[PDB]
């Protein structure tokens, strides 16, 4: 039974592997889909000896360059327990390092810093394997990793967040082990010692009080009396007030005092992060701008700058406490969709390409992001336009409060009433006039609007498939030169925002009144609806590849960050399959492309669903 089924799978799979390898060799570049197919077969049935032998033959025959497209998946399976699969991946990664180590170093550099012992050992083994030919590259990459971790989150932010969360664990949760475990590594941060002028300044400014509070903590450990811990937390709260006052003042960061090594770097052979392509000359890094702008957001992301050896400058965003591995995977999915839309002639005509930005995660919780130039976040655009017109920014929300000062307590239909009045009493024409004014002339403006509508349709519908959430005006950007919409956050995926207790969203995507008004006058039914029809046609036609990519997503614990997690992943993949096939709404029935698109537009535009969303989500906008 089980063995007979395994034999059946093997004898249907080996031909599959061989055929995929031959097809990949034949395609030469438009083979991302098939690459994921073979990766799926590899990671599922690779361990069988015949399948592994076929894989080895294919690896020998296949051109190495193809594997670049799926380095993130490969290293995601670097610590696969199955010994044969792991051995073959190790050989493949060693070859990739020998040929194109630039494409491989960064995720491997992450894997070296992985807390997992198996991943740590495998990454170090593979690193020393490439060292014999790329010692300089590996050393520079590791130093960049460490130094950009240093820059991304400084001891000030580390300690602010540590004290805040630990205080919440005490006064909120009372889990002694919680705060003490949280603080212990943060204490090791100084007991390893400072290494930069900013770290030394933090030491001389606060580390004395931190050391005293840690002494009080040890006193509480040995004794347990509340007095010692009370003094420890008094000191912690004092330094917390001081550092919290300091933090708004740190509107920028000078590299000389923050990380002298990065400033010293010059004429490196390391490629600019997320810009290496074997079919192009390597863009080597020779600069790190001394200044780094810090954005006032709660996460305090840094703005970094590099100079390409070619004579071109690059900008990057640098974030900490975000697992940008999910962002990298989503960006690869969008690249897959770009290939899909370029392959289909109907979409090929109309330029449905998704705007994407290079994402280079360089830690389990911190990473980089390609900074896209000439992009204005929707919230900034609306704010600027209203300030120019002197319209009060939250005029809609102010009206909502004016009729219903206690809106959040209203039932559903009361909310619908107040929201409908707020929409009606306000013109809600800001974005159309804004696209008009920003444009130089109607000839340019029309191309901008066409690209805007088509890009919004494409990315909205792909986000519905992906279950993208919290599409609030700070997560949408307009490209001034082209007008394409750009989505800049994927922390929430797979309807996760639709299940959280705090304002569970109930719209598959953002299609509020203002975006629709920004379209042609006959907004939804023209460019947007036809483009959504085309996009769902493309994505359901090739649903298997997208399903494979989302399987690579779910089967790692990222979205839940074991049997319960497997159940959740199975359910998420089932929902995505329903979305792709049409069984999302009426599971018993199957909905054609126009029917599902119309249902989605109705759900996303309906005031009943819009009103339920967080006011900060700006549903009225």
């Amino acid at each position: 039974v089980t063995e007979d089924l395994s034999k059946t799978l093997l004898m249907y799979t080996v031909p599959a592997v061989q055929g995929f390898f031959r097809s990949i060799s034949l395609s030469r570049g438009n083979n991302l889909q098939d690459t994921l197919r073979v990766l799926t077969l590899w990671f599922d049935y690779g361990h069988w000896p015949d399948v592994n032998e076929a894989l080895v033959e294919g690896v020998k025959a296949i051109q190495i360059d193809t594997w670049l497209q799926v380095i993130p998946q490969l290293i995601a399976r670097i610590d696969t327990p199955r010994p044969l699969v792991g051995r073959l991946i190790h050989q493949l990664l060693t070859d990739i390092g020998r040929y194109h180590p630039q494409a491989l170093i960064y995720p491997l550099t992450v894997a070296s810093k992985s807390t997992t012992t198996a991943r740590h050992n495998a990454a170090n083994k593979i690193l020393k394997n490439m060292c014999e030919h790329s010692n300089t590259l590996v050393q520079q990459a590791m130093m960049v990793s460490e130094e950009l971790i240093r820059v991304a989150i400084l001891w000030h932010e580390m300690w602010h967040e540590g004290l805040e969360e630990a205080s919440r664990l005490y006064f909120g949760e009372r889990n002694v082990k919680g705060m003490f475990e949280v603080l212990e590594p943060l204490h090791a941060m100084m007991e390893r010692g400072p290494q930069t002028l900013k770290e030394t300044s933090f030491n001389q400014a606060y580390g004395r009080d931190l050391m005293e509070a840690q002494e009080w903590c040890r006193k509480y450990m040995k004794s347990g009396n509340v007095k010692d811990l009370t003094q420890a937390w008094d000191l912690y709260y004092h330094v917390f007030r001081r550092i919290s006052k300091q933090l708004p003042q740190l509107t920028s960061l000078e590299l000389q005092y923050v990380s002298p090594k990065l400033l010293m770097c010059r004429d490196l052979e390391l490629a600019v992060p997320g810009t290496y392509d074997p079919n192009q000359p390597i863009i080597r890094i020779q600069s790190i701008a001394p200044s780094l702008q810090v954005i006032t957001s709660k996460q305090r992301p840094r703005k970094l700058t590099l100079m390409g050896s070619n004579g071109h400058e690059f900008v990057f965003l640098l974030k900490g406490h975000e697992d940008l591995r999910q962002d990298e995977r989503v960006m690869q999915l969008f690249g897959l969709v770009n290939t899909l839309l370029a392959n289909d002639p109907t979409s090929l005509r109309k330029n449905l390409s998704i705007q994407r930005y290079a994402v280079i995660p360089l830690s389990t919780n911190s990473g980089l992001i390609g900074w896209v130039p000439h992009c204005d976040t929707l919230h900034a655009l609306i704010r600027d336009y209203r300030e120019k017109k002197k319209i009060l920014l939250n005029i809609e929300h102010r009206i909502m409060l004016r009729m219903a000062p206690d809106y959040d307590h209203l039932t559903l239909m009361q909310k619908v009433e107040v929201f409908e009045h707020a929409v009606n009493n306000t013109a809600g024409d800001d974005l159309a006039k804004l696209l008009w004014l920003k444009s130089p002339s109607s000839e340019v403006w029309f191309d901008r609007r066409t690209n805007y509508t088509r890009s919004l349709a494409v990315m909205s519908m792909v986000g519905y498939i992906l279950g993208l959430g919290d599409r609030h005006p700070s997560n949408l950007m307009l490209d001034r030169l082209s007008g394409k919409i750009l989505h800049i956050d994927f922390g929430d995926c797979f309807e996760v925002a639709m299940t959280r207790e705090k304002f569970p969203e109930k719209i598959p995507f953002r299609l509020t009144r203002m975006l629709t008004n920004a379209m042609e006058v006959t907004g939804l039914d023209g460019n947007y609806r036809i483009t959504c029809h085309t996009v769902m046609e493309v994505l359901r036609e090739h649903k298997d590849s997208v399903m494979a990519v989302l399987e690579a997503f779910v089967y790692d614990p990222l979205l839940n960050w074991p049997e319960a997690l497997n159940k959740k992943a199975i359910q998420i993949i089932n929902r995505v399959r329903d979305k792709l096939t049409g069984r999302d709404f009426s599971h018993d029935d199957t909905l054609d492309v126009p029917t599902q698109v119309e249902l989605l537009i109705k759900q996303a535009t309906s005031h009943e669903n819009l009103c339920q969303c967080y006011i900060g989500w700006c549903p009225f906008w």
């Binding site: 000062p405 206690d406 307590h409 239909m413 009361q414 009433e417 009045h421």
Partner: protein, 317 residues
């Protein structure tokens, strides 16, 4: 408050309840209801207490005494509550909120905890009482009317329209028919089997009634069961005849001018002791008492600063 035989209650978003005399339309007194707006206002059969539903809690005030404070307050529910019902003797109370649970309560004891709970898949909204007082008819956001037996828990459910939120519930005093509406504006009716102690309460479908296009959110029968009035978010209300369910009535507050339109939904209605006069809410900060036969203005209850939501209106000689 009970000096006049007829007592009218009203409330809005200003967190202040107000009382009125029907015929004269004269304000009797104001009352403070803060920490939440007013969802449902109801008067117990004894007319000695009024219940106002808000967020997470329900607050009761007294009628016999003028200028009291909240005499009773029930808490505990984790979501907004818009449903109220009482037994004819004033002993039991029945409520239900968006937390998907409908609760029973004892009014003549200190049972601050719910006597029983009935859960449904979707959030619950306005509930009504079978005149035998042994069965509750409940509307939810999924579109499923739930008939739940208080005594034997004989439970049935029916979805008349696919996955559309239904917000209304009321059954005629004769128990002969039941009716409801939903967000689509359609009105639905059903016939009731003549079983008081049969405990099966079998229903029979009746033809759909597209009463309105906008959100139809109210439904009430007259004390004599002659009429069925439903409010609707087209700032309108329509009254149908129980015998034939043919519409000859209209209660519109439309300004007529298209620019001034969308003034405010018709938010509630209540029949007089003979079906002649109707007292109805309006989110234009107002409530109005009209004559059903003529459907004309006869009195308006001004004074609110913020929109009205619900009314309580009782007739007695």
């Amino acid at each position: 408050v009970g000096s006049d035989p007829v007592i009218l209650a009203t409330a809005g978003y200003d967190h202040t309840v107000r009382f009125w005399q029907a015929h004269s339309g004269i304000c009797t007194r104001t009352v403070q209801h803060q920490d939440s707006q007013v969802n449902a206002l109801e008067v117990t059969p004894d007319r000695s207490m009024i219940a106002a539903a808000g967020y997470q809690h329900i607050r009761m005030y007294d009628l016999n005494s003028n200028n009291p404070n909240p005499i009773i307050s029930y808490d505990g529910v984790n979501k907004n509550i818009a449903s109220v019902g009482f037994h004819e003797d004033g002993r039991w109370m029945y409520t239900g909120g968006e937390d998907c649970t409908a609760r029973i309560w004892d009014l003549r004891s200190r049972n601050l905890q719910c006597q029983r709970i009935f859960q449904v898949n979707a959030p619950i909204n306005c509930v009504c009482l079978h005149p035998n007082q042994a069965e509750l008819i409940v509307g939810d956001q999924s579109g499923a009317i739930h008939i739940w037996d208080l005594k034997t828990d004989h439970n049935e459910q029916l979805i008349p329209e696919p996955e559309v939120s239904i917000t209304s519930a009321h059954i005629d005093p004769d128990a002969s028919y039941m009716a409801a509406v939903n967000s689509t504006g359609n009105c639905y009716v059903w016939n009731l089997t003549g079983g008081i102690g049969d405990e099966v309460t079998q229903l029979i479908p009746k033809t759909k009634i597209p009463a309105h296009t906008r959100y139809a959110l109210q439904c009430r029968f007259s004390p004599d069961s002659t009429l069925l009035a439903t409010c609707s978010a087209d700032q309108t209300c329509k009254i149908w005849r129980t015998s034939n369910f043919s519409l000859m009535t209209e209660l519109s507050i439309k300004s007529g001018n298209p620019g001034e339109s969308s003034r405010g939904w018709m938010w509630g209605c209540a029949f007089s002791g003979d079906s002649q006069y109707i007292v109805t809410a309006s989110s234009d900060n107002l409530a109005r008492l009209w004559c059903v036969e003529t459907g004309e203005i006869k009195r308006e209850y001004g004074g609110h600063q913020k929109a009205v939501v619900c009314l309580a209106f009782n007739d007695s000689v």
